[PDB]
Symmetry: D3
Subunit: 148 residues, 6 copies
Amino acid sequence: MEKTFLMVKPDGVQRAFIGEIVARFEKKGFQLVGAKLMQVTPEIAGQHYAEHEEKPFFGELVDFITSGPVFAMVWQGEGVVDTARNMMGKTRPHEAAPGTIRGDFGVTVAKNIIHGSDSLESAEREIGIFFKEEELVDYSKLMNEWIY
Amino acid sequence: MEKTFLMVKPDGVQRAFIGEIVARFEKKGFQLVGAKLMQVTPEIAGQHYAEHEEKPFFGELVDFITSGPVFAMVWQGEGVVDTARNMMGKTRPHEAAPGTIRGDFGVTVAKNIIHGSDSLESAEREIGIFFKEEELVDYSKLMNEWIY
Amino acid sequence: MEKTFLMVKPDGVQRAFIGEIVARFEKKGFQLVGAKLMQVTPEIAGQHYAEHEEKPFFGELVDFITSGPVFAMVWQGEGVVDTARNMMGKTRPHEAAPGTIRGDFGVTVAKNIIHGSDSLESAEREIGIFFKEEELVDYSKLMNEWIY
Amino acid sequence: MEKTFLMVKPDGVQRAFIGEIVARFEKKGFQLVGAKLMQVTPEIAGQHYAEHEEKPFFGELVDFITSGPVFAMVWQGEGVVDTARNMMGKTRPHEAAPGTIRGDFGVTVAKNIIHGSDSLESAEREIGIFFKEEELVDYSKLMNEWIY
Amino acid sequence: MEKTFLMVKPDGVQRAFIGEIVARFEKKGFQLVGAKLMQVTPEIAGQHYAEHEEKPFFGELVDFITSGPVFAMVWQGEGVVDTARNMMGKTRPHEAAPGTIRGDFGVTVAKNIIHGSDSLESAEREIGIFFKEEELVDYSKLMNEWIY
Amino acid sequence: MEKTFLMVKPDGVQRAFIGEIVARFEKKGFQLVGAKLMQVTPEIAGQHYAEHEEKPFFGELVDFITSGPVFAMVWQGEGVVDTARNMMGKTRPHEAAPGTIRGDFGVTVAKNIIHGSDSLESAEREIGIFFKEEELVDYSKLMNEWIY
């Protein structure tokens, strides 16, 4: 099944939104398969910093090294990459709809709470950067019987 | 005043969303005039199964006979048929907006939480199928003085 | 498994708390097996009005005939009779703890939101008064695998 | 920084939504700089009643004199005027999206819960009508360090 | 009817709890009759600073002059003084029960979110210090018909 | 500052309560310093299984090897060990107060949602079993300025 990478940015950590964000994905019916609180390091940020022109997230990673920890997650489910983008709302919170995460919680594009992968291709790459294979848990969620 | 038929599907029952769904319609200001937990039977499902080509709900009813109870409701208020459709969101939860019931709680079209009437004409028919006249309560809701 | 009778009084109906109350019992893990919105009639209230001295609920029933509908429910689970009393809080809302239903939502003993059976013996009697056997649904709740 | 005027109408007061509305603006990250519960008087309503043809709010003010108190607020933040309009939803609650204040809580345009300024120009005027300079508090909100 | 004084301390302001706190008193069924965001001044704090030995709140007032605004409220209802104390929880949040305001939101006695009057006598005095008679609104709350 | 170990048991995972539980500790004002979703292995469970007579948690660990992942957390703050016990409620959910985690969400002692350390001494030991030193993040939470 499809997997996406989602990360609460240091501002979401500081403003105490981790629980609220996780709850939204849990109530939606998606399955949590990896989660850790962690510090972004130069080693992580350097891996892909050369690609920051085409992918600005790899630029933001550099800023996170000195700003506070992030909460990194891998979620699994049908159409999760695009659906999670929908649930986050537009990147600029001024443009994000009420009911979305950025819409409800964010003010500026600088401090916009959350990142999620923009495509399947970037999801595979971002998961590989933040998680070792053995940190991803494979289990069956019983309630999937009423979700699918 | 206008009335619509709303039904929590067996998946909404199983996933424990009845209270959350009722609360949304209560906070909106609509008035609850009929409600029962019930099993869909062959007698109910056969009434209109011949019309399943033009109305797919009458097809789904057949599946509910063996899958678990539903929570059937009649709500009353100004423009309630169309507004309740708005609040449920698109039939396919991938297309439903965050903030709507399907948007917040559903993943697949198969298990999409809730049905509501698509028109006044189908509301009258669906109410008549699920409720006897004497199961609908006529009462005045005092707070209507500040809703209308 | 054990069953209790719970009823949202006309004041809980009017103040739009049905959804919130159902949600609390759903999140707790109890199983909903009967539910209807209904009007209390003289026939229902007369059945046991002679016993109102020893059981004051049968007195209150008389008042409900002219005051508005009630939302009657049957919940099932381990120790549900006593646990539901715990969750409702003390009968007098001034004495009820915050976190309980009466504690969070009620002010006076006259308008104290909710009734639930005080014992197994009164649960069996109250269920029999409000529900016919065929209005109680027997089904398996999949999530019980993680509740018990 | 930018400021807007927001007012819970007498219907939002009566239906007990003041806390819920304030919480939405607090979670968004905006800063509360003025707030009072107050009665609209003839003196307030007459100030601009001549302009009611071009601005219908000044018409509604007249109706509020005899209908109940309002809860008047001044919020501050980047793009707060337009963002607060977004969060309130369309003026007609039938047209308002779920997730917005009118979308979630209102039924009719007559009783549509909340007013907010439609532009910076009307924000400056409305703030001046409802608040004296000394009722507006100037303070620093520490969490702004993670909002901006 | 009985009235109490409640005040969100500068820490509750800063941590963005005003809405959540108001909502709890609104859902309980109490009636809001005065509310303002305000700065504590030397003139207010000096009025009763001589009594700080017997009443430590008059000591805390002095600290608030330089620390940030407070949100001052007057609530009305049956038994509101003692009930509001119940809802706030023990003064020391370590001793406060979950479900109470201090229990859910506070860590230390220094930053314990909220003050409310300890008796009717102190309620009358504190209301007189923070509110002029004309800032208290007298109105009828329709829903009181289902609360009392 | 003081640290405790908290773990959402496989039942809390399966019933989709991770977000709700994290949110309660975040709103309280505690600081999250370690978090991971993980599978309990024989190597982890064997470390202290010999001590299961005096500490029954080390017995439960064995059961978790084959039952599903757990969500392990380290929280930091003043008096966090005892306060977190308070917030969880009694071990037997029938005895737990409404407003506590077990009180609101659990039915049986077998499936009682959450574990937390019973003392400082057991907190130090349990943290060492589940987390390497480098998985614990040391950072400053700005809002601590208004919590302490």
